[PDB]
Amino acid sequence: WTATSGSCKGRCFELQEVGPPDCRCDNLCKSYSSCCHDFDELCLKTARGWECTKDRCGEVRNEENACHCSEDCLSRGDCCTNYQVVCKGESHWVDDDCEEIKVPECPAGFVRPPLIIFSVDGFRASYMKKGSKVMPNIEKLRSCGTHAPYMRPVYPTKTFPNLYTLATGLYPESHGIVGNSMYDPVFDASFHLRGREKFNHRWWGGQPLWITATKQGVRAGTFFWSVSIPHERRILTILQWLSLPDNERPSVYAFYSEQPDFSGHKYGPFGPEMTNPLREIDKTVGQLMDGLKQLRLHRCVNVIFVGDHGMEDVTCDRTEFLSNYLTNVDDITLVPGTLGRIRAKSINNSKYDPKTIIAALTCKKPDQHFKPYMKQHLPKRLHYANNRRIEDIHLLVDRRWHVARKPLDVYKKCFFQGDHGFDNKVNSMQTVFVGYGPTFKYRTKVPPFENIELYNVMCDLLGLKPAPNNGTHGSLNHLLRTNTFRPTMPDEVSRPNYPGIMYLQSEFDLGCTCDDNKLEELNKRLHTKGSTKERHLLYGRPAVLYRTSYDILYHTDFESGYSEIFLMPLWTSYTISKQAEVSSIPEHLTNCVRPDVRVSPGFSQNCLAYKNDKQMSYGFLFPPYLSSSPEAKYDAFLVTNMVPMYPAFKRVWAYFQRVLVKKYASERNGVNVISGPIFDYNYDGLRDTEDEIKQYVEGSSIPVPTHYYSIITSCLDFTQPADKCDGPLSVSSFILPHRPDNDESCNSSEDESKWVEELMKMHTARVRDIEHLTGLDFYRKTSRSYSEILTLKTYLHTYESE
Numbered sequence: 001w002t003a004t005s006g007s008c009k010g011r012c013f014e015l016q017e018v019g020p021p022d023c024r025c026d027n028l029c030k031s032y033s034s035c036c037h038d039f040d041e042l043c044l045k046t047a048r049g050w051e052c053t054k055d056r057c058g059e060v061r062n063e064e065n066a067c068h069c070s071e072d073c074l075s076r077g078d079c080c081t082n083y084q085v086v087c088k089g090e091s092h093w094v095d096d097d098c099e100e101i102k103v104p105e106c107p108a109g110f111v112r113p114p115l116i117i118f119s120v121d122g123f124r125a126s127y128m129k130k131g132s133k134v135m136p137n138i139e140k141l142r143s144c145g146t147h148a149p150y151m152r153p154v155y156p157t158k159t160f161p162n163l164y165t166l167a168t169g170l171y172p173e174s175h176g177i178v179g180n181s182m183y184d185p186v187f188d189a190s191f192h193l194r195g196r197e198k199f200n201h202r203w204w205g206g207q208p209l210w211i212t213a214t215k216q217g218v219r220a221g222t223f224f225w226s227v228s229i230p231h232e233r234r235i236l237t238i239l240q241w242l243s244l245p246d247n248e249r250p251s252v253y254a255f256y257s258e259q260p261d262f263s264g265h266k267y268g269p270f271g272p273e274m275t276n277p278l279r280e281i282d283k284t285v286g287q288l289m290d291g292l293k294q295l296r297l298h299r300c301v302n303v304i305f306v307g308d309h310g311m312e313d314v315t316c317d318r319t320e321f322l323s324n325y326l327t328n329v330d331d332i333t334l335v336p337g338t339l340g341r342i343r344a345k346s347i348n349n350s351k352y353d354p355k356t357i358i359a360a361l362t363c364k365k366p367d368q369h370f371k372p373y374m375k376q377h378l379p380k381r382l383h384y385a386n387n388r389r390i391e392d393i394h395l396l397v398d399r400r401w402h403v404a405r406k407p408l409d410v411y412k413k414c415f416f417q418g419d420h421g422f423d424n425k426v427n428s429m430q431t432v433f434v435g436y437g438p439t440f441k442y443r444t445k446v447p448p449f450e451n452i453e454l455y456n457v458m459c460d461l462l463g464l465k466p467a468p469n470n471g472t473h474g475s476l477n478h479l480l481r482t483n484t485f486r487p488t489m490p491d492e493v494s495r496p497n498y499p500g501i502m503y504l505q506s507e508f509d510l511g512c513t514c515d516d517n518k519l520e521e522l523n524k525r526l527h528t529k530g531s532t533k534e535r536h537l538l539y540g541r542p543a544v545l546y547r548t549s550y551d552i553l554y555h556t557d558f559e560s561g562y563s564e565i566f567l568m569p570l571w572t573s574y575t576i577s578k579q580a581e582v583s584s585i586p587e588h589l590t591n592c593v594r595p596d597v598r599v600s601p602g603f604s605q606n607c608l609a610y611k612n613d614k615q616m617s618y619g620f621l622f623p624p625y626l627s628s629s630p631e632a633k634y635d636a637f638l639v640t641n642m643v644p645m646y647p648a649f650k651r652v653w654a655y656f657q658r659v660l661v662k663k664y665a666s667e668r669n670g671v672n673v674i675s676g677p678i679f680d681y682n683y684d685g686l687r688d689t690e691d692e693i694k695q696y697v698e699g700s701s702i703p704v705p706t707h708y709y710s711i712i713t714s715c716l717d718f719t720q721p722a723d724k725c726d727g728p729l730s731v732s733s734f735i736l737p738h739r740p741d742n743d744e745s746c747n748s749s750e751d752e753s754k755w756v757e758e759l760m761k762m763h764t765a766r767v768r769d770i771e772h773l774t775g776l777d778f779y780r781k782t783s784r785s786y787s788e789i790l791t792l793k794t795y796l797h798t799y800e801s802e
């Protein structure tokens with residue numbers, strides 16, 4: 001019940017929302033059908049349009065007008081945004097030469113530059129270039145301020161998950177808005193775009209910026225706007241709030257536009273009908289900037305122009321139907337479209353088996369335009385598993401396609417030519433970022449970055465301490481003139497042991513066998529003390545950020561941090577120069593595993609466990625193929641370099657080690673590789689403790705990794721070799737799932753040169769993703785600034801073209 005007989009006189013767009021059955025005048029009241037009777041009349045005036053004209057100049061104030069051209073309007077803060085242009089001979093902001101804003105130039109009484117976030121739904125990254133002739137305000141923001149060529153959204157590349165990620169710095173799995181549509185089985189409740197259940201706060205985790213601001217004493221405008229409030233009214237309201245008295249005036253604001261997303265769905269991302277929406281957005285920006293300039297706020301406010309996601313070409317004819325794969329198609333519920341999520345229609349149905357559904361959806365048609373996954377097998381870079389609202393079965397859908405349950409669902413609902421929601425590395429899903437103002441840099445281009453990083457920066461812009469989030473705070477310090485956040489390296493928690501020779505051969509009963517001078521004896525000892533370690537450990541040893549027991553093991557060709565708990569290296573580091581040679585494994589050594597005399601039998605793997613485990617085999621972290629000499633090659637067969645590997649996974653690993661590492665070294669002028677295992681049994685994106693491990697090599701305490709990582713580092717300036725690099729680094733990494741089959745790659749019966757590299761690209765990762773998963777901290781000893789290293793650790797090599 002709403003007693004809509006209260007009134008909105010003097011309460012229009014009130015910042016504190018009032019509690020039913022008192023009626024509402026806030027910018028969401030329309031959406032809850034709860035505005036006071038007089039809201040439209042008082043708060044949504046439109047009389048006489050949105051622009052002063054010569055004749056209106058000087059007029060007698062008439063409170064019915066949408067905006068005013070009287071003399072008193074400035075002090076009231078309710079002039080039309082073009083008043084001074086039309087009535088005082090001033091220029092439009094867009095026509096002014098840009099000038100560096102070295103310091104905030106704010107009116108007295110401002111305690112900090114305000115921040116205005118101008119968010120645009122579906123504003124694809126390439127619009128900045130391709131629409132540049134029709135968006136002159138936006139292009140001035142872009143060229144005069146700080147911009148990225150594009151900004152990476154989060155998966156799924158839908159509106160609500162992305163707006164709320166922008167607001168909180170959290171991955172959807174952590175904030176809870178995992179799609180535009182959702183079932184929570186604990187609530188036994190559904191969430192949709194349409195309707196009331198999305199207004200319930202229990203859907204919305206973390207702490208978004210407006211609440212972070214409020215709790216720390218910074219006042220916030222209301223970010224949300226009901227769809228019927230026209231854009232011109234949203235701008236005027238923001239400008240009005242900015243005219244408020246110091247003790248009431250907010251410091252942070254958001255504008256939101258439904259365009260160009262709304263048109264993009266109907267006409268496609270580059271439909272000729274898309275030029276007008278782009279013009280209109282630009283004109284709204286112009287109105288804001290002119291408005292700010294009238295209030296002398298145009299060199300005082302920080303403005304963020306940001307999108308939630310892009311837009312791709314998609315039509316009804318490009319639909320895969322699950323009815324063409326499953327006989328049982330009515331025993332499932334599909335969340336459909338540009339992704340799929342599948343659960344049972346009924347939990348009472350005990351014959352529903354996700355495994356058989358997955359198999360019926362796997363590599364069934366030669367050009368199949370979706371790929372099914374258990375959520376935990378999705379690429380780790382998507383961070384899309386650790387929420388009860390994300391279904392166990394997921395369909396990653398090819399760009400340009402839709403998935404539906406049955407054909408009736410498509411023609412009983414062609415309408416659309418644009419959609420989004422695909423994989424967040426797809427170019428068409430990329431969006432924009434521009435920062436303009438005293439706190440942003442001047443005429444600066446920054447590299448692409450992910451939208452999870454912005455919450456921290458908006459916090460920095462407002463002098464706030466951010467709630468705990470998934471950004472890496474400092475990785476965007478290079479966007480800012482000042483208010484940088486100066487982080488320190490996390491402290492190492494466990495220090496390594498440096499074991500020497502302590503055990504005799506005959507103390508090992510491992511079931512392992514191997515067919516195996518004073519100048520070259522002193523030599524191999526000094527390789528076991530770490531004489532070549534400057535070569536193989538280029539960026540310092542990783543710091544272990546939890547409590548555990550481990551050993552640093554030196555060798556001629558590689559260095560490792562060996563875990564006595566997990567019985568294998570946490571990391572293995574080695575450098576392969578451009579000049580290096582690949583050799584094969586000689587025959588006498590094919591099944592050779594050698595005891596490591598620095599590590600007790602009791603902290604070693606054994607070969608007999610692998611012999612008895614019919615499913616599990618083993619591989620090596622430092623590849624024997626890249627040994628520097630026949631004598632060094634013996635070190636690669638130490639038991640302490642061994643890790644558990646399914647035969648299906650060895651195909652991948654072997655090809656990566658034998659072929660690809662040499663290739664990258666050749667193309668990048670040497671590489672440093674750090675590889676190791678990852679244990680994420682509960683798919684939370686975080687390092688598992690021992691008691692979380694669900695699988696061991698049969699009959700042993702040898703835990704099985706869920707994934708294998710490698711971090712491949714070289715000199716950004718590739719004319720310098722990786723091991724003699726003076727400047728910025730360049731990195732690519734991956735987190736390969738450790739799977740007993742290659743069902744994920746439909747062409748895996750072919751030669752590895754046709755599918756392995758493609759799999760690795762799919763499983764590209766940020767170093768930061770690996771850190772979370774391992775509890776290690778990399779690049780501790782470089783000659784680069786820590787902020788620069790943080791940027792590098794957040795880098796994702798995506799493998800899309802320009």
Ligand SMILES: *[C@@H]1O[C@H](CO)[C@@H](O[C@@H]2O[C@H](CO)[C@@H](O[C@@H]3O[C@H](CO[C@H]4O[C@H](CO)[C@@H](O)[C@H](O[C@H]5O[C@H](CO)[C@@H](O)[C@H](O)[C@@H]5O[C@H]5O[C@H](CO)[C@@H](O)[C@H](O)[C@@H]5O)[C@@H]4O)[C@@H](O)[C@H](O[C@H]4O[C@H](CO)[C@@H](O)[C@H](O)[C@@H]4O[C@H]4O[C@H](CO)[C@@H](O)[C@H](O)[C@@H]4O)[C@@H]3O)[C@H](O)[C@H]2NC(C)=O)[C@H](O)[C@H]1NC(C)=O
Pocket residue numbers: 170171173174175176202203204205206383386387388468469470684685686772
């Ligand atoms: C991205 O960044 C985020 C934020 O930093 C990271 O997520 C954090 O991860 C932390 C570590 O896993 C986690 O810390 C836990 O907090 C528990 C209390 O949490 C509540 O309070 C916080 C703070 O106010 C609040 O934000 C939480 O909100 C979550 O849950 C509600 C659902 O009710 C949602 O509305 C909301 O969206 C959010 O959901 C997400 O998080 C939860 C987990 O917290 C997930 O399950 C969801 O899927 C979703 O992803 C909470 O209301 C605290 O209880 C935990 O403590 C247990 O484990 C510790 C280990 O130290 C142990 O010492 C304790 O004994 C305790 O165990 C007891 O309970 C167990 C479970 O019932 C039981 O098994 C034991 O036997 C014990 O009895 C833990 O300290 C933190 O909450 C989240 N924060 C957020 C916002 O998600 C995320 O890791 C980052 N991602 C990456 C890849 O880096």
Ligand SMILES: Cc1nnn(Cc2cc(C(F)(F)F)ccc2CCC(=O)N2CCN(Cc3ccc(S(N)(=O)=O)cc3F)CC2)n1
Pocket residue numbers: 028031117119159160161163164165166167168198199200223224225226227254255256
């Ligand atoms: C989603 C979402 N997450 N955060 N925002 C806020 C946000 C964040 C950012 C910024 F970029 F800065 F983060 C920029 C702009 C915005 C505003 C987006 C917006 O006006 N709309 C129109 C209204 N719909 C419906 C809607 C209505 C009500 C609610 S409530 N609070 O009552 O439960 C939830 C709703 F979804 C959402 C989009 N939107």
Ligand SMILES: [Ca+2]
Pocket residue numbers: 121122158159160261308309
């Ligand atoms: Ca959107």
Ligand SMILES: [Ca+2]
Pocket residue numbers: 679680681682683684685686687688
């Ligand atoms: Ca985990």
Ligand SMILES: [Cl-]
Pocket residue numbers: 156158178179180181335
């Ligand atoms: Cl969805």
Ligand SMILES: [K+]
Pocket residue numbers: 610611612613614615616617
């Ligand atoms: K075996």
Ligand code: NA
Pocket residue numbers: 742743744745746747748749
């Ligand atoms: Na296959």
Ligand SMILES: [Zn+2]
Pocket residue numbers: 122159261262265420
């Ligand atoms: Zn959309």
